[PDB]
Each structure stands twice: as structure tokens, then as C-alpha cells.
């Protein structure tokens, strides 16, 4: 056994002498239970949060099938085939297959999250006419079916699972087979598919990051500046009682009101014409302009100057007609920003905890030094496997932390 010396090796003391997987398993279990309860109680069990809950359920059901077996094998001081009567490595293949399957399903689920988020934000017509709640709920089963179909290659074909040191760490074979048609094929295909899905997810997230900025810039240039102009003119007119500034200040107010009458809130963008939610907007601005016209004609045609009943009636009009739409629009934008900020960190975590396995698989594919234990360097597979593992324990805790309002809004406002 020149390469992969530890194979069918009884002594499991080669790799490490430590115990730190139990605390990780307990932390993940408690965090996933907390997140599951918090998400399923306040939400009565939004497609985005349904995707998040399905992904956390899959992660919880995944880590609890693979951590206790490693713990038991390390406790009994038996390798992955000596602890139980698994003839001809009936457990090493199961371990490797389940690990690869769960990683693939998680990456596909994150890709689906980013894709439907971008589609919902980008094209409201397609999102409202095609995507339903059932399709969003049923992402996990078809993804898992495709993942198991992809990973069931060695059963109906040729695919090599091997054990890296220590006694229990089983994964697909990468290096030093001296060339076969059915050995390096899966080793290249796995990392190629991983990189493709990661790049697709990053592309979708980058599109969704710009669509919302376009929406926010539209709203800020369309409503708030006109609102500020109305407020500033209404403040200016009171502080003076000359007969010249009243009329042109009022016509500046009229210009700002006519500009603001054409704007639109985001959700009402779905159906702009003949909208009662827009008809009330237009009616309120009609009343405001009519009051400005009454102030212009009756009061300041002659040089008589009362102007204060008109100013106070305009203040009542503003405070009673318009503020509802502005407040609800700002709330909607803040909600959407928080949702995409939640999704971005999950994408970053999944992407940046998958580079070592990819570049190791490509390192063993086209580069061939064909030596083992070169300056005691076989821990690359260990690091890749342990990072693919540690993706699970840090996924729901960041969601729990981000959903805590003790500091999630203080840093957002300050920074």
C-alpha cells in the first residue's frame, strides 16, 4: 500500500489523540433546535424563510447521522470496519456517500435560495405568475433525489472510496491511481460541479444586490425630495409676511406637488393604473393643490395677506393624507434589505468553506508527483473533510444571532 497507507488498519491512534467533536455536536444540536423552534413558532410553522427552515432541517438531520458514528468509533478504539461487522467495507462507503450527498444537497439548496430571491426581486410579473408556495416548499426533495442519483455512481459503475488517516475518515479517492477512465472522472466532476454552482449563486446574489439599489434610488429621487421641498417652503412662508414671497413660494409648492403626484410606492408598482392605493395618493395631492390655489387666488391677488388658515389647512392635509404611504414604503425597503443581508452571509460561508476540497481535488488530478507522506503532508484531505463538516455547526447560529434585535439594528444605523 504505497498511497493511502491507513486502509483496513485496526489501530486508530495514527491521526489524533483528542476529544472535541462532542461539544461541536451538542452546540449544533442546541442551536438547530433553538432556530427551529423560533422559526416555527412566530411564523406559524414567506418562501424565503421556508427555504431557510428546510435547509436547517436538512442540516440537523444530516449532522446527527454522521457525528455519533465517528464518536463511537473513536471511543471503542476500533476502525470504521472493526467496530461493527461491516464486511468488505460496508460502512466506509456509506460514510463517504452520505457525506458527499449531504454536502451536495446543501449547496443546491443555497443556490435555489439565491435564485428565487433574485427572481422575486427582479421580475415581479414572472414571480407572481409562476412561483407558488408549493414549488418553494418542494426544493429539498428533488435536490436530494438529484444528489443521490449523482452520488450513486460506484454502485452501478466504477468509483473508489478510500479511508484517509485516522482510522475513520472515508471519502472519494483523488491521488495516485496511475490513471483510470473511471477514477479521475468523478474526482474532477465533483469539484467542477461545486465551482459551477458556487459561481451561479454568487452571480444571482450580485444581481439581487443591484436591483434593490436601483429601487431605493428611484424612491429617494421620486418622493422624499419633493416632500422635503414642500416642508421647507411651508416653513419659510410662515416666518415672513411680505406680499412678494408668498405667491412665488406657493407656486414653488405647486410645482413640487405636481412633481410628487407622479411618483410610485414599490408594491403599488405592480399595478399602477386604476389603483385605489394610487387614486387616494392622487386625490390627496389634488386637495393640497386646490388649497394652494385658494391661497393664491383669494388671499394674494389683492395685497391682503392672511395666509395662515391656508398654511394650517395644508399642514393638516399633509399630516392626514400622505404620511401613511411614505412610512409603509420605508418599512418595506428596510425589510428587503435585512432579508438580502441575511442571505449574503450564508452564501459567503458556503463559498469560503469549500475552496480547500476543490483545489485539493484539482491538485491530485492534473499534477502528479506520486509521492505519499511528502514532508508529512497528508492533512489536506483532513482539513477539507473537517471544513465540509464544520459548515453544519455554524449555519443556524449565525441566523439566530442575526435575528436578535439587541444589536442587529444598532450597527445597521451606526454603520
Amino acid at each position, epitope marked *: 500500500s504505497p498511497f493511502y497507507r491507513c486502509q483496513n488498519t485496526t489501530s486508530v491512534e495514527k491521526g489524533n489523540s483528542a476529544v472535541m467533536g462532542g461539544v461541536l455536536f451538542s452546540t449544533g444540536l442546541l442551536g438547530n433546535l433553538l432556530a427551529l423552534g423560533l422559526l416555527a413558532r412566530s411564523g406559524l410553522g414567506s418562501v424565503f424563510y421556508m427555504l431557510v427552515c428546510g435547509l436547517t432541517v436538512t442540516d440537523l438531520l444530516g449532522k446527527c447521522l454522521l457525528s455519533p458514528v465517528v464518536l463511537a468509533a473513536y471511543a471503542q478504539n476500533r476502525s470504521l470496519r472493526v467496530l461493527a461487522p461491516a464486511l468488505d467495507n460496508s460502512l466506509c462507503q456509506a460514510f463517504a456517500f452520505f457525506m458527499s450527498f449531504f454536502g451536495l444537497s446543501s449547496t443546491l439548496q443555497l443556490l435555489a435560495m439565491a435564485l428565487e430571491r433574485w427572481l422575486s426581486l427582479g421580475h415581479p410579473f414572472f414571480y407572481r405568475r409562476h412561483i407558488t408556495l408549493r414549488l418553494g416548499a418542494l426544493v429539498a426533495p428533488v435536490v436530494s433525489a438529484f444528489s443521490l442519483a449523482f452520488c450513486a455512481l460506484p454502485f452501478m459503475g466504477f468509483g473508489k472510496f478510500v479511508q484517509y488517516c485516522p482510522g475513520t475518515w472515508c471519502f472519494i479517492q483523488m491521488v495516485h491511481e496511475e490513471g483510470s477512465l473511471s477514477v479521475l472522472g468523478y474526482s474532477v466532476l465533483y469539484s467542477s460541479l461545486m465551482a459551477l454552482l458556487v459561481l451561479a449563486t454568487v452571480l444571482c446574489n450580485l444581481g439581487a444586490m443591484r436591483n434593490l439599489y436601483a429601487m431605493h434610488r428611484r424612491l429617494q429621487a421620486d418622493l422624499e425630495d419633493n416632500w422635503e421641498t414642500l416642508n421647507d417652503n411651508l416653513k419659510v412662508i410662515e416666518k415672513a409676511d411680505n406680499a412678494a414671497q408668498v*405667491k412665488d413660494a406657493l*407656486t414653488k409648492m*405647486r*410645482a413640487a406637488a*405636481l*412633481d410628487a403626484q407622479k411618483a410610485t410606492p414599490p408594491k403599488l408598482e405592480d399595478k399602477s393604473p386604476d389603483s385605489p392605493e394610487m387614486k387616494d395618493f392622487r386625490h390627496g395631492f*389634488d386637495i393640497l*393643490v*386646490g388649497q394652494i*390655489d385658494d391661497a*393664491l*387666488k*383669494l388671499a394674494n*391677488e389683492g395685497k391682503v395677506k392672511e395666509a395662515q388658515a391656508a398654511a394650517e389647512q395644508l399642514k393638516t392635509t399633509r399630516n392626514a393624507y400622505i404620511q401613511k404611504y411614505l412610512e409603509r414604503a420605508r418599512s418595506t425597503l428596510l425589510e428587503e434589505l435585512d432579508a438580502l443581508l441575511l442571505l449574503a452571509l450564508m452564501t459567503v460561508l458556503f463559498t469560503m468553506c469549500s475552496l480547500p476540497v476543490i483545489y485539493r481535488a484539482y491538485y491530485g488530478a492534473f499534477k502528479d508527483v506520486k509521492e505519499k507522506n511528502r514532508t508529512s503532508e497528508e492533512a489536506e484531505d483532513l482539513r477539507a473533510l473537517r471544513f465540509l463538516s464544520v459548515i453544519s455547526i455554524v449555519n443556524p447560529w449565525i441566523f439566530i444571532i442575526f435575528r436578535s434585535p439587541v444589536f442587529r439594528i444598532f450597527f445597521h444605523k451606526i454603520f
Partner: antibody, heavy 125, light 109 residues
Framework: SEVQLVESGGGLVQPGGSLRLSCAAS????????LHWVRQAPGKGLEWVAYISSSSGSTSYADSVKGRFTISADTSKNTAYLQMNSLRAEDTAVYYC?????????????????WGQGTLVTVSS | DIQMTQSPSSLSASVGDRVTITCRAS??????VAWYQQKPGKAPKLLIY???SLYSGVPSRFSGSRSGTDFTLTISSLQPEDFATYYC??????????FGQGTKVEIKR
């Protein structure tokens, strides 16, 4: 009928004289539509003179003609009148009367959809 | 009482080409700008109101566009019966109405 604004009261008058331009509108009520006076010098641009609204009875004048021009209207005759009392040299022109609607809606956005043919006013010693 | 600066004063064009005239307001009059066509010796006529909309009966060769404070009148296929004078006017209040200087189009030779 058609929105026609037929004018009268035009001729040669001495400087310092007085004249009464009469604009009679057809097909619509003078109360429902604001009436404005627009004048044009011979071979020059356009110039707006005065504004009358019969529902509110509100009048307004340009800077040059205020205090010397008197705008009025009678709904019984459906007519607008402009009285000129101090005519200087720079008043020989062609005069016409245009209509306008009331806020809000479509009629306000269309400003001067109908005009008048105009009448000649000449002052010379 | 808001100015409407217009340019050029007079332009020479052929028949079939497209021409553009620009009117600039002194301040934001929103979307209330009108265009008028006048032959020598006749009353002016309205072509484009609300700074973009086409008046009823006006031929489709005339188009109006608004870019902030700038307004543009464009004639695509300059027919032989389009050699006249063109004015731009802003209207904000009943006492706030102001016309432009005008421009004249003549024949290339």
C-alpha cells in the same frame, strides 16, 4: 358650437384717447372658462395682456397695462370687455382673446387650445 | 413670469430631413410647456401640450421631450408646408404665462 372668439372695436385713435375692445365667445359659457388677452406687435413675438375669471370675479393685469387697462365681463351678454384709457406710441398691435379651463383635470393642462383672429389697434398723430 | 430661452433664431433645411429645437426654462415649471406654430399674418396654433403630449389634429411629425428643465421639439420628415414660426410657452399660474422668442425655418439652396 365651435369655440370661436369673435372680436370687435378696432380702428385708428389719437394718442391719449380711449377705446373699448369687445370679445364675444361662442359655444360655451364665459363663467366656466377663464379669459385672457394676448397681443402681438407687427412683425414681433406674442405678449399676454390681462386675465379675467367670471366665477370668482378675479382680475389681473400685466406690468405695462395695469392701472391703464380695465378688464370686465358680463355673463348676460357672455362678453368680455377691455377698456384702454392711456394709449402711448408702443401700442399699435393685433389683439386677440384666448380661453382657459379650471383646475383640476384635463382642461387645466391644455393652456391655449383656442385663440382669436385679432383686431388692429393703431395710434398716430 | 418665467423665461423661455429659445435657439436658434432661424435655420435653413432641406425637405425630408429632421430638425430639432430646444427651449430652456428659467426654473422648474414641472411638465407644463406648450409649442405654437404661426404663419405670418395668422393666429398661433397649439402643437404639443404638457411638454410631451400631442394635441388633437397635429401631425405625428412633431414630437416633444422633457429632460429636467430642457424641452425639445423634433420634426422628423420636414414637409414643404412646415416653413413657419415656432414658439415655446410656459404656464404655471393664471397670471404666470410667458412665451418665447421664436424660430423660423427656410429652404436650402
Amino acid at each position: 358650437s365651435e369655440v370661436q372668439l369673435v372680436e370687435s372695436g378696432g380702428g385708428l385713435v389719437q394718442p391719449g384717447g380711449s377705446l373699448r375692445l369687445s370679445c364675444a365667445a361662442s359655444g360655451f359659457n364665459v363663467v366656466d372658462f377663464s379669459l385672457h388677452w394676448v397681443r402681438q406687435a407687427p412683425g414681433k413675438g406674442l405678449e399676454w395682456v390681462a386675465y379675467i375669471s367670471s366665477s370668482s370675479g378675479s382680475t389681473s393685469y400685466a406690468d405695462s397695462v395695469k392701472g391703464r387697462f380695465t378688464i370686465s365681463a358680463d355673463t348676460s351678454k357672455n362678453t368680455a370687455y377691455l377698456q384702454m384709457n392711456s394709449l402711448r406710441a408702443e401700442d399699435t398691435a393685433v389683439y386677440y382673446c384666448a380661453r382657459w379651463g379650471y383646475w383640476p383635470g384635463e382642461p387645466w393642462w391644455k393652456a391655449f387650445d383656442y385663440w382669436g383672429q385679432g383686431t388692429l389697434v393703431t395710434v398716430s398723430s | 413670469d418665467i423665461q423661455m430661452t429659445q435657439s436658434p433664431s432661424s435655420l435653413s433645411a432641406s425637405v425630408g430631413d429632421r430638425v430639432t429645437i430646444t427651449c430652456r426654462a428659467s426654473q422648474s415649471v414641472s411638465s407644463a410647456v406648450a409649442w405654437y406654430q404661426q404663419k405670418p399674418g395668422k393666429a398661433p396654433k397649439l402643437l404639443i401640450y404638457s411638454a410631451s403630449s400631442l394635441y388633437s389634429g397635429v401631425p405625428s411629425r412633431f414630437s416633444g421631450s422633457r429632460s429636467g428643465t430642457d424641452f425639445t421639439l423634433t420634426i422628423s420628415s420636414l414637409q414643404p408646408e412646415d416653413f413657419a414660426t415656432y414658439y415655446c410657452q410656459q404656464y404655471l399660474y393664471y397670471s404666470l404665462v410667458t412665451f418665447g422668442q421664436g424660430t423660423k425655418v427656410e429652404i436650402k439652396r
